[PDB]
Design a binder for this molecule. Structure first.
Ligand code: COA
Ligand code: COA
Lengths: 210, 211, 209
């Protein structure tokens, strides 16, 4: 699975977490990987190339089929209880992506803080697509094949509809966002994981949202 | 071939149909699987877990790489001569999805009567995204990577354009639906399978759609 | 490769890499030219039919292309173009042309054909005949872009990720995105490397100003 080449790399994967069929590659220096405890990080391909990169996955995170590329001085922070299917996260330009607590990311997600190539204005010659941090709030549910691009911030307890592309940030919590261009399509809601909970009151994990 | 667990489960797969490389799993009671004559249901993964589940696939249906998950009291019905490439069909909340005669589904389809997870109103705590049935009419062609969500009904003789997401129903037949949001972009058409034909009149399977 | 039929000509430069690539040619009078210093890896290229042409110029890099060509079709890819994983389909005796120094990100789908007919009820005639696709020089396709029949893209254009193009554009030097597809930013030029504060530091970009 794991493969390192470089100096002063710190890799602590809790011994209670599972990493079956996962590939971890670290090329470079002064990097840190932190996983566990009670994590299931399976069939993924995670790549850190450079210096001073931080990968932080908190307790109780379940990821399956993530392809992840991090360049120098980048950091990926995924908070506890977050679940993630197949997808891709790319970070470059010494930026950050953070994913809050108790998120649910369905298969097909694509998350990035960068276009990986420059676009310049012919008017003044300046670059106009610098990378920008992605912040994904607590208790966010991304439907299938959602794409989250650079600089986008998602509030807490928000649902993003299947196949939506987000180019811009939103400020309102407790809403559903869908369509193209992306927009608030429903307000004043809260989502849960279990359909067998008839009401939000039957879900202990939701107490805080109401 | 298939793995079956439980009581009063019935499985009828015609001996003239091919199921090469397909896994069929049925767990529960009172479930029924039917696959008619001269079908090719290949490289597929089909799961029935629960009670009173129905899977009915008529004659001359060809399916390649279907991933299909059905739960209790759910039913999937696919009528004769329909062809399907790689894709996913998910049915829960005791609902139903039906696919009509002579449909053509290109690789990439995602079809569901359900969101799989509850959305509650903050006003009164009630669930407001209950599952809803899906009905795909006769002679519907789905282009590549089309997504059909809960409650969607598609009229007969319709083409859905590549990468279209349908979140609500349409009523107009004989049209092309595409874009986002999904809308009728062309009217008064009929589609066929074979590019070699000069005109619709040359395709006997299309007689019923223009009279 | 795997070549079967009469008078097929396959010329792949000895300076080019084809690691893990399946090239299958079934039919007659087909021709494949791949130029110098190419890397065509982990791809699956199928020519099924007769009188098909595939021309790939120098310094082209392709990783994970699934390509299907039918009789009398042609695919041309000009020098210095790079392409990730994706799919190209040509039929109805048509052609697709990709210009110089393009950059095609993972998930592209490019086709000159719908593969099945649509007829008008007014007269029974087919209204969706295949139509050539032309991608200009120095075009950058973001992730998961879909290019449908008849589409012509001007030089020096960026196509935003997940965009579907159904219609041609005329304006060079722009960003195209959204649905429907529209010009979302004018008067730009893209580059490959981000270690350049301005466009004047990229020698490759001079011909655009
Ligand atoms: C996000 C989602 C859960 C919200 O569903 P919902 O709360 O029941 O709300 P709806 O989807 O019916 O739509 C709410 C409104 O937005 C509209 N809307 C939905 N999708 C839209 C689209 N893509 N473009 C424009 N409007 C859209 C609806 O028409 C509706 O309008 P209305 O107020 O007039 O009724 C659901 O839309 C969805 O994307 N389902 C897929 C979930 C999924 O991918 N699960 C798989 C594994 S996690
Ligand atoms: C659905 C499809 C077959 C329709 O073909 P068509 O009859 O020639 O349709 P057109 O390209 O002429 O488009 C019809 C109209 O809708 C518009 N349109 C098509 N797709 C659109 C979309 N993505 N968003 C917005 N508008 C769209 C067109 O611009 C056109 O508008 P206009 O007539 O006012 O100029 C074609 O769009 C398509 O999706 N082809 C790919 C099919 C495929 O996946 N094949 C392989 C799997 S079987």
């Amino acid at each position: 699975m794991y493969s390192e080449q470089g100096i002063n790399n710190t890799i602590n994967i809790s011994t209670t977490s599972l990493t079956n069929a996962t590939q971890l590659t670290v090329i470079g220096n002064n990097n840190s990987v932190y996983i566990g405890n009670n994590c299931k990080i399976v069939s993924s391909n995670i790549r850190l190339k450079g210096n001073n990169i931080t990968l932080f996955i908190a307790d109780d995170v379940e990821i399956m089929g993530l392809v992840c590329s991090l360049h120098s001085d980048c950091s990926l922070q995924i908070q506890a209880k977050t679940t993630m299917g197949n997808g891709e996260i790319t970070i470059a330009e010494k930026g950050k992506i953070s994913i809050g607590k108790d998120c649910m990311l369905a298969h097909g997600y694509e998350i990035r803080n960068t276009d990986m190539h420059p676009i310049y204005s012919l008017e003044n010659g300046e670059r106009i697509n610098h990378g920008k941090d992605v912040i994904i709030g607590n208790h966010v549910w991304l439907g299938r094949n959602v794409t989250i691009l650079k600089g986008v911030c998602i509030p807490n307890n928000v649902v993003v509809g299947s196949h939506t592309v987000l180019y811009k940030s939103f400020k309102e919590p407790n809403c559903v966002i869908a369509g193209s261009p992306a927009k608030i399509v429903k307000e004043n809601i809260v989502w849960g994981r279990k359909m067998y909970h008839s009401t939000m009151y039957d879900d202990p994990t939701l107490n805080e949202f109401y």
